[PDB]
Design an enzyme around this catalytic site. Sequence first.
Site, short mmCIF file in Angstrom:
data_model
loop_
_atom_site.label_atom_id
_atom_site.label_comp_id
_atom_site.label_asym_id
_atom_site.label_seq_id
_atom_site.Cartn_x
_atom_site.Cartn_y
_atom_site.Cartn_z
N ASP A 125 5.76 3.84 4.52
CA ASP A 125 4.78 4.56 5.33
C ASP A 125 5.45 5.68 6.11
O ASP A 125 4.90 6.78 6.22
CB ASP A 125 4.06 3.59 6.26
CG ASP A 125 3.21 2.58 5.52
OD1 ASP A 125 2.60 2.95 4.50
OD2 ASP A 125 3.16 1.41 5.96
N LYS A 141 9.13 -5.29 -3.84
CA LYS A 141 9.60 -5.09 -2.47
C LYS A 141 10.30 -6.34 -1.94
O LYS A 141 11.32 -6.24 -1.25
CB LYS A 141 8.43 -4.72 -1.57
CG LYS A 141 8.66 -5.02 -0.10
CD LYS A 141 7.36 -5.03 0.68
CE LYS A 141 7.16 -3.71 1.40
NZ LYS A 141 6.47 -3.89 2.71
N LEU A 170 4.14 -0.12 10.91
CA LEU A 170 4.25 0.63 9.67
C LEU A 170 5.44 0.14 8.85
O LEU A 170 6.35 -0.52 9.37
CB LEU A 170 4.39 2.12 9.95
CG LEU A 170 3.15 2.80 10.52
CD1 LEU A 170 3.35 4.29 10.63
CD2 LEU A 170 1.93 2.49 9.66
N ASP A 171 5.42 0.46 7.56
CA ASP A 171 6.53 0.17 6.67
C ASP A 171 7.50 1.35 6.64
O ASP A 171 7.24 2.42 7.21
CB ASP A 171 6.01 -0.12 5.26
CG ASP A 171 7.00 -0.92 4.43
OD1 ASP A 171 8.16 -1.08 4.86
OD2 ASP A 171 6.61 -1.37 3.34
N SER A 172 8.64 1.15 5.99
CA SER A 172 9.56 2.25 5.74
C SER A 172 8.93 3.29 4.82
O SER A 172 9.06 4.50 5.03
CB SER A 172 10.87 1.72 5.15
#
Lengths: 274, 88, 128, 104, 178, 459, 175, 124, 70, 63, 84
Positions: B46, E51, B42-44
């Site tokens: 997320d 990003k 997962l991402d931050s």
Amino acid sequence: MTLCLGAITTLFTALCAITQNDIKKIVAFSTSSQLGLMMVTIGINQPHLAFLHICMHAFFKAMLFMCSGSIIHSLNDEQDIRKMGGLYKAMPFTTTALIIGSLALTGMPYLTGFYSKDLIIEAVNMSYTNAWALLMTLIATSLTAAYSTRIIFFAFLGKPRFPPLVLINENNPLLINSIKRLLIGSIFAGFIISNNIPPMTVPNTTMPLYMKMTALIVTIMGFMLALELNNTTYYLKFKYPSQTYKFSNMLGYYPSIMHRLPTYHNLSMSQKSA
Amino acid sequence: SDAPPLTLEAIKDRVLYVLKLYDKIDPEKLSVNSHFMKDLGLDSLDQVEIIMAMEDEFGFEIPDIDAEKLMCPQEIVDYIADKKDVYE
Amino acid sequence: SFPKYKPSRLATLPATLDPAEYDISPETRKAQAERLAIRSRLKREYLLQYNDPNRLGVIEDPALIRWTYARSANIYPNFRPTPKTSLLGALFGIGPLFFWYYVFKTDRDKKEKLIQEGKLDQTFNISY
Amino acid sequence: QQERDPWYDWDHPDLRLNWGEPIHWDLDMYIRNRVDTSPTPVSWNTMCKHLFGFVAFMLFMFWVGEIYPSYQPVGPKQYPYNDLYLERGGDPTKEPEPVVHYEI
Amino acid sequence: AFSAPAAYLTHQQKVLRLYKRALRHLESWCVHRDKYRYFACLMRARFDEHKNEKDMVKATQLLRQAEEEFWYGQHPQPYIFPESPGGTSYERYECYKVPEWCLDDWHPSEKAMYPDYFAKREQWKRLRRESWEREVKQLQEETPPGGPRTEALPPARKEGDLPPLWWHIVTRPRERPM
Amino acid sequence: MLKIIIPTTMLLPMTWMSKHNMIWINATVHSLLISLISLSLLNQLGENSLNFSLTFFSDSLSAPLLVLTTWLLPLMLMASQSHLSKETTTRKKLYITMLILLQLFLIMTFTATELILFYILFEATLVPTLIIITRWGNQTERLNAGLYFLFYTLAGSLPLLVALVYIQNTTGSLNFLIIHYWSHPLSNSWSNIFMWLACIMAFMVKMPLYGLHLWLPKAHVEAPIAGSMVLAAVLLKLGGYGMMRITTILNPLTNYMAYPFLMLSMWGMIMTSSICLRQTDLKSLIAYSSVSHMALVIVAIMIQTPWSFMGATALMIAHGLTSSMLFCLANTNYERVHSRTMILARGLQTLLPLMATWWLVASLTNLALPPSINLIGELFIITASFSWSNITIILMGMNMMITALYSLYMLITTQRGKYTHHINNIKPSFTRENALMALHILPLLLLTLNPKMILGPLY
Amino acid sequence: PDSWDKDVYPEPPRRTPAPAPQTSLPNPVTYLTKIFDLLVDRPVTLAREFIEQQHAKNRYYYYHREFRRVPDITECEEKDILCMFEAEMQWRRDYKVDQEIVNIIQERLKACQQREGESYRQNCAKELEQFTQVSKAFQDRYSDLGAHYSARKCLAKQKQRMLAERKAAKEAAAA
Amino acid sequence: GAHLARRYLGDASKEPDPLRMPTFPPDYGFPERKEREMVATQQEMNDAQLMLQQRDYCAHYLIQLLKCKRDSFPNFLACKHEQHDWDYCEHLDYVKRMKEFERERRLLQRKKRREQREAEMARG
Amino acid sequence: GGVHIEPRYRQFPQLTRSQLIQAEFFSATMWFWILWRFWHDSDAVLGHFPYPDPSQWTDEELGILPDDED
Amino acid sequence: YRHSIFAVTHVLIPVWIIHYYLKYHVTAKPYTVVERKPRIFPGDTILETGEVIPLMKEFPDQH
Amino acid sequence: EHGHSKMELPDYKQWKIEGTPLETVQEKLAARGLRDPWGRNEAWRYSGGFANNVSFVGALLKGFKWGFAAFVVAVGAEYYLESQ
Ligand SMILES: CCCCCCCCCCCCCCCCCC(=O)OC[C@H](COP(=O)([O-])OCC(O)COP(=O)([O-])OC[C@@H](COC(=O)CCCCCCCCCCCCCCCCC)OC(=O)CCCCCCCCCCCCCCCCC)OC(=O)CCCCCCCCCCCCCCCCC
Ligand SMILES: CCCCCCCCCCCCCCCCC[C@@H](O)O[C@H](CO[C@H](O)CCCCCCCCCCCCCCC)COP(=O)(O)OCC[N+](C)(C)C
Ligand SMILES: CCCCCCCC/C=C\CCCCCCCC(=O)O[C@H](COC(=O)CCCCCCC/C=C/CCCCCCCC)COP(=O)(O)OCCN
Ligand SMILES: *OP(=O)(O)OCC(C)(C)[C@@H](O)C(=O)NCCC(=O)NCCSC(=O)CCCCCCCCCCC
């Protein structure tokens, strides 16, 4: 001075209520607007009509707050209408009681609020007064219809918007009986009291047909305009607010400035010089 | 009030329930101890969306300094248990 | 193109709009470290006294004592007669007195003159 | 004192203070029960302009409505007994000038 | 609330906080769930195209203009959870929270009721009395010279030890005592 | 009138011959009996006075002050019992002796049918209170407070002595009855203006007037609890009483010479009410509230109307009771926390609910909440001032607003919010403190039922 | 009631309409007043009968004090303290009696205003006029004396008023 | 409304001031001038003590309505003929007021025309 | 004092028949009252007396003489 | 039973005390209890005197 | 005596994007090449008794049918009873 104060109060408070998200705040501003209308009635030399409006507003506004508290309690202490979804079927008795209270507040014909607000609008229309006070009174009636629409639409009509664990419960005889007594009040007390008190003022027997219909026309226009503008929130578009919305939401900026500028300038001096 | 006294089992069940409707996570793979950053990729962002979903689920708001460093479902469950004071 | 926010004394500038937090420098980080260290020693002292089972009184706060002493008892030894202080004291201590004296004197002169003229209508003015 | 971090674990949670730190000279003026300087969505000058403009416009238009009143196309009400002389003040020993109302 | 603060906030923390604030105020603006989901996904996409911005300078010019954008579009009446610092029940039960030491001042006739509770209370007090003389020594031996640098407390490392300064964290009154 | 003086004098050998553990009980019982005996003086008659002898006389103005003076001593003993526990028997007896001598002088002061005897006792009261402040005071500022209290009062009072002997040498008498019956007007002259000033300034210092009030926060903050009680309740009223007595010889000079004091009182009430809002000390706040109320009393006495005097008498009695109660509450807090700063101990309603309701009632009486006698005096003075001039209502309304503000601020700061975490020595209220508060407040609400008892001789 | 004098506190003869019901529907007011009578007025009446016979069993009288007239401040020498004292006490008694007279007239006025209903502006002209007269006389006698009023100050006020009257009458006669 | 529009946007001198109306003698129209009649007398209208503003030319109907309401108390809907009679008399009174307003306006117009024609004749 | 209703977790809550009938009965009562009163008192919401037309009134009724009398 | 005893101790005793106090103490003094005079209309008769108020002027009754 | 009935959480595979406005949100989102990851979390708000909506006018006319029926029968009875 009484007429001007009442007119500005009712208009400004309806304007503030038109955009509030706290249900209790909306009903509080509704009470403020109704009090402004009461002293508007005082200013046109109609005291007994103002007293009758006091008696009617007692019933239907008390029951409106009652229903608001029922909604707040059943939703685990939640007051914001943004987390209030479809309660039309989940809470039927509160729904019908709030509908009846909003109809009486908006002066539906033959509703407790009819026998006071209707004659108040008639009397202010048929009197030697300001043009501006009259204009603000009519606009305030429209805004009353509009914020009643806002409460109903944003609290009862859409899809549910509250947390998943549903604790909705209406089945307590105390709440039901307490609500329905004021329901019977809001339905019949206006007719009963108006027909049981002796006449204490000369009536507005003959009026132009458009002027007699002014109250209903203004309430219906407010209903429709608020409903159409509220239906636009389903649209999948996002726009930044205007200066008018910012002014209405922040209560005309009156609580900000007046609760920071004088108080500070008092307390500061209260140490610096004295 | 009339609110039930939620327990650890209910909290854990609800956390896993909310996680399972996250289509970004395969339901058959996630476990109570499944790390978000590595075990699930997962991402931050997320993770912050997950913390938002848990907040909206339980009806309270987690501070950012305490939210940003919750990395397991059991970790979230224990934080909620500490906040709500549920011992059983 | 968004209109800028202008801070005031009673509506201050938000932290997320402060250019200072974006003008990052190593000495800024040093200062932040020292500030957190000061708060850390102070909090350690407070918690060490606070969780002591043998303590059965009040944890005295020298900061609060300093605040009260500065507010009350430190004023006069640090007062100097300067143009600002002298003018401000004269104004705020005398001006209201003379202003109110003039107002009430004018009112009572008018009332006495009207009474002597007889055109005041003191009917039913029994209790005074 | 309102705009301090509400989520930090202060030693004085209500006052949002820590044991040991210097106290502001005007702490009792900023106590979350009194004047707060927390930033607002709108600028102070803009709020002042809008509130002053609204109040001034309402005052002006109330005066304008005073100058241009609103009424109905009717004459004054007619009252029978010498404009109700005796029931308003009396003085029945003066024989007032009779005023009578014209029937149309 | 529980976790200690750091000396500062890193860039990633500020960006995450801005994302949280923007999504919350967007949810306040667009009320309905479908509208909110659509515009939140649009927001995430708008939050994602930069990003991978590598250098710090334009990545700092970015997240600065975004703050001005948010302050311009912040919905002056955001939704607040009822128990949050802005909520309508923020400190509603704060007047029902009575400290535990009040129990020491009860009349013996009051302690005649609830004997089991006060037996357990005496056991807790004895445990605290021993643990305290252990923890002062542990904290003295573990603190670096020149005083603590952060608001962090080491855990208990021995068997019979308890974490330093535990009494006023575990003996909290309750979330809703009544 | 000797039936009240002789028992109060017998109080001294009664205390000095008592056992080491019975002094408080005997003193309280017998002072309470004296308080009961004094109530007979309340039976006044609409005509002249109760002329008991050539040396003493009672009046509808002297009687309520005498009753309050006699009633205060048991409360002072009950309040002083606690903090004097670790004191030697001889010095406790000396403290009680100081209180008894102060009561004796106060009793003789109000009767005092002649003006020089009134002056002598009025000045004699200064010694026991000075000794009480400078001996049994905690902080190091009790010495400076004693010096200020001494020298303000004496600098005010010496020209009064000169003027009094002058008046006796010109008119032949200083007896109040002869003075009242043989009154002659004061012509507009420099000598007459200075005689007016010499007569007035002595009592204007002790009210205290705004600008001459510097001694009061010092002498009230730094004094023991009994000292604060007697200072606020009775000792501030002496000047008021004196003015009501002496202005019978100052007419018609009073109309033109009262303007500076009227302006000073009217503005200083606002100034001190505002000062109360920014105060980090409870005793200081109560002292400045006392200053405001006595400024209103000064305005009443200077206006010189029947309603002004009725309101002034009512307000004097009411303020004495209310300020004594407030000082006692603050001392109950202080004896637990030992700090006397208002922000330290918070949320005390959660830990001491009955102390909280006592605080609430004291605030409501200080608030001038109808139908309390505080409001009766306030409203009568306000009505008389309105008749005097119509713009006065501006200042009076602003003062009532700020009074409500700071009273509720003091209540909310200490009783509401969240308790201070690190303070854990807030023991439950003793029966002594609750009884003290009840004995303060019940007479107020009982006096609301018979207001004519405290409306003075002009009722 | 024989307790108070009808002439001092006059009351109109209290004409009341007869009940002339127009319909055969029974009104609840008469039933309610009948049950109120039976359930409240009868026991209260019996209690009062008991109390009154007990009071009659022990009958005793109290008297109204009579005060002899005394020379006033006009026929008192400048420093004669005893004559001044007696005259001053007499003056204070007269002041209190005049206060009570004004109170009586005010009670009359208030009762008239309440009793006359909507026609008070017309039907209470006599009481309003007599209160105006009494108020003017009381104001001339006692106003502006001050907190330290006395018989000498009232006499001085009267003397200056009659100097003004004498001057005005002399000017009018010689006009 | 239209009268306000005409007075505040058109010529004010051609429209009446409601505060000072009438501005003309009442015989100026026709000389018969039948007088208004009042049915309720002085004493009994006082004894009904209606109100000061309710003592107008329709007082008899209001007195009858009040008497009916008093007599037939519990059935508070029995007095409908009396209330309708009083309201119809009030309607006639208001219509007469409107007629007075229109008469004042039209005599004002006639006076304006007469003065203008006289001025034109004098000029010619 | 009421009855027992258990939570649902994302499902519609329980509804007792009594609350449904009470709500529907009171709504029907309000609407019947409005229709009944309106049928009975049409005039209150419409008016009983027509508004006269000032222009229709003749010159002779208000005494209008076109510069003929004087 | 509870309702009956409640209406006895909370309604009946206070009304007894109040009616005694009003009838035998308050009304003993003049003007303490004043009533607005009841309305007199044409056509009523008076209990005290027995006379009848003369009727009205027989206005033209049409519509 | 409280609500302790051991409430069981439903199945998490019931909630589907289909047939709800979340489907339209998904279509418009994929039109720009995106996807909502929380779509199935909010389907319960459109699933059970919450599936159907009521219009504002339909809400205000909550019990109009029974009221109209009662009004009709009452007026018919009055019409029959009066003409006699
Ligand atoms: C004689 C002829 C008779 C016929 C009469 C005419 C017939 C009808 C005509 C219709 C006219 C328009 C009707 C609609 C009204 C506007 C509603 C609207 O669209 O709002 C959206 C729109 C902004 O929407 P948004 O920001 O996108 O909303 C964000 C989201 O929607 C977020 O939304 P949300 O969910 O949070 O909440 C939505 C809420 C929030 O929306 C708002 O922002 C509220 C603000 C709009 C309401 C204001 C309406 C009336 C204002 C009265 C003010 C009095 C004078 C004040 C003067 C101030 C001077 C500084 O809006 C509502 O709920 C409904 C709004 C009210 C509509 C229903 C009733 C209005 C009809 C009554 C108007 C006239 C009829 C009177 C009847 C009797 C006949 C006489 O509002 C406006 O654009 C404002 C329009 C009018 C404002 C005029 C004031 C401007 C002052 C500037 C200075 C001028 C010079 C002064 C000189 C001073 C010198 C010192
Ligand atoms: C806890 C819940 C409540 C429990 C209690 C329930 C019962 C409630 C009843 C109590 C309050 C209700 C009000 C009832 C009032 C009736 C009593 C009243 O009538 O008496 C007053 C009389 O009371 C006294 O006047 C007031 C008391 C005296 C106060 C002096 C204080 C005592 C000494 C204390 C020390 C003094 C220090 C202060 C300096 C002055 C006024 O009477 P008055 O019409 O006039 O004449 C009496 C009758 N006469 C005509 C035959 C003569
Ligand atoms: C808190 C500090 C207060 C300080 C003292 C305030 C009081 C000051 C008032 C004056 C004091 C002396 C008054 C004298 C006593 C009265 C006697 C009297 O009036 O007789 C006068 C005497 O009058 C004087 O002698 C006055 C002289 C004053 C000397 C001392 C002056 C003190 C300071 C004066 C300036 C300040 C005045 C006001 C201060 C107010 C407080 C700030 C004349 O009588 P005969 O001569 O016999 O007859 C007339 C025909 N030959
Ligand atoms: O891997 P993670 O730890 O999760 O890191 C996340 C992320 C990689 C995105 C981030 O931490 C990061 O490292 N970014 C590097 C560069 C960067 O992101 N620079 C800033 C980009 S600008 C931006 O955020 C887009 C602007 C959108 C904000 C507009 C506000 C409008 C809303 C107003 C209310 C409706």
